[PDB]
């Protein structure tokens, strides 16, 4: 027997606000009297956006649509009701971005035998980045890693051991490569230590 015909769609959401994509968001506010004002608030300070009035439902709704980013929008926009001598409702956004770039941390110069303690830092991200590390164009064994809680994002820390006295004493310098990668991105800085005597 026939089945009936196949229906695709496609469904919107739901996905964490990512990067930079046209987010919209709203306010809704059922009329009292007198007719109340319908702000949008980021950082306390009104963000210029009209507000709309529906007069036969005697609803006030106000549309804000912006791209998303990751400087803020890990915070919260308001919603302010106003009437003379105000009815408030806050909304805290969650924003996935790539880490910017990262930092590392050591010496430039080693003695020869001796070993090397170098550290590195990511700038900021959602989610948490995976720090990896790369020495004379080999991938060595990650580090464990110590992730930070900022405003805004998560900041991940490795720190990673170069030995010279594996190397050989024809060895002039070290490559030190690391890289902090998440699903939204990825960004990498390299380090170079001079061998001294
Ligand atoms: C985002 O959507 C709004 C309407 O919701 C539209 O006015 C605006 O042009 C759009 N911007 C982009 C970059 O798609
Ligand atoms: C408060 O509301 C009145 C009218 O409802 C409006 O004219 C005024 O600008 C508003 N003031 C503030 C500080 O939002
Ligand atoms: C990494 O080295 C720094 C010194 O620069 C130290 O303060 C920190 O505790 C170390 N962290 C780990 C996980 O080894």
């Known amino acids: 027997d026939p089945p009936s015909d196949p ?89 996935n971005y790539p880490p910017a770039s990262v930092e590392l941390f050591g010496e430039s110069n080693i003695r020869y035998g001796s070993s090397a303690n170098i550290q590195c830092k990511s700038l900021p991200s959602n989610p948490a980045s995976q720090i990896t590390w790369i020495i004379n164009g080999r991938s060595v064994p990650t580090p464990t890693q110590r992730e930070f809680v900022v405003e805004n994002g998560i900041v991940s820390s490795s720190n990673v051991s170069v030995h010279s006295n594996e190397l050989s004493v024809e060895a002039h310098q070290i490559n030190v490569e690391c890289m902090a990668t998440n699903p939204e991105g990825s960004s990498a800085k390299q380090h170079v230590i001079k061998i001294i005597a």
């Open 7 to 95: 229906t695709v769609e496609i469904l919107r959401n739901p996905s964490a606000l990512r990067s930079g994509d046209n987010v919209t968001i709203a306010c809704s506010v059922t009329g009292g009297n007198p007719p109340p004002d319908v702000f949008w608030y980021h950082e306390n300070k009104r963000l210029q956006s009209h507000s709309t009035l529906d007069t036969r439902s005697k609803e006030i709704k106000n549309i804000y649509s912006f791209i998303a980013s990751q400087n803020d929008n890990m915070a919260e926009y308001e919603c302010r009701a106003n009437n003379s001598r105000p009815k408030r409702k806050a909304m805290k956004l969650e924003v």
